[PDB]
Amino acid sequence: ACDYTCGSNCYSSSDVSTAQAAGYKLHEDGETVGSNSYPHKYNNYEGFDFSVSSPYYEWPILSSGDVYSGGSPGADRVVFNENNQLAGVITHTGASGNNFVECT
Ligand SMILES: Nc1nc2c(ncn2[C@@H]2O[C@H](CO)[C@@H](OP(=O)(O)O)[C@H]2O)c(=O)[nH]1
Ligand SMILES: [Ca+2]
């Protein structure tokens, strides 16, 4: 069973922890990767009711299982905060335009 399901993409808790660790490391070092500069601030315009405090940062999680290093980030993202706490897993899949919906 999937711990998080983003459209057709299936992720386990370890998939998320691994992606999150990479994104947080970059955040701590003040570095970014890719043309859209990840990780970067996630404003939560969608208004998700996250259990942890802001600020939030978004970082791509790939269905291939690899850690994001550049190029297309796909539709999925892990959202973490300043204390490296997982806020949630979100996706562009099933959402209009560049909006997000939560992975179930
Ligand atoms: N939909 C949405 N986009 C956000 C939010 N906060 C920041 N963004 C940025 O606006 C764009 C929406 O897809 C993305 O930038 P990026 O394309 O540079 O990665 C995304 O990172 C938010 O809360 N909602
Ligand atoms: Ca996996």
Ligand 1 atom index nearest CA of 40: 21
Q: Which of 34, 36, 17, 13 has the alpha carbon at shortest distance from 25?
A: 17
Q: In the chain, how many domains are there?
A: 1
Q: What is the resolution of this structure in A?
A: 1.8
What's the CA gap between 29 and 14, in Å, rounded? 23
Task: Return d(Cα 27, Cα 31) in angstroms, integer.
Answer: 6
Q: Is 58 touching ligand 1 by the criterion CB < 6 Å?
A: yes
Asked whether 55 lines ligand 1 (CB < 6 A), one says: no
Burial class (CB in 10 A: 0-12, 13-18, 19+), 54: middle
Residues 26 and 47: their CA atoms lie apart, in Å, by 25
User: Distance, CA 3 to ligand 1 centroid (Å)?
Assistant: 24
User: What residue numbers bound the domain in which 34 lies?
Assistant: 1-104
CA nearest 89: which of 67, 45, 56, 53? 56
Please report, to the nearest 10 degrees, the dihedral formed by the alpha carbons of residues 25, 54, 83, 71 taken in order.
-20
Tokens of 52: 């942890």
Contact 70, 34 (CB under 8 A): yes
DSSP 8-state code for residue 81: E
Query: What CATH number does residue 17 fall under?
Result: 3.10.450.30
Task: For the chain, report the end-to-end CA distance as a whole number of angstroms.
Answer: 12
Joined together, the tokens standing for residue 12 give 């386990």
Answer yes or no: are the C-beta atoms of 6 and 103 closer than 8 Å. Answer: yes
Whether 93 contacts 6, CB under 8 Å: yes
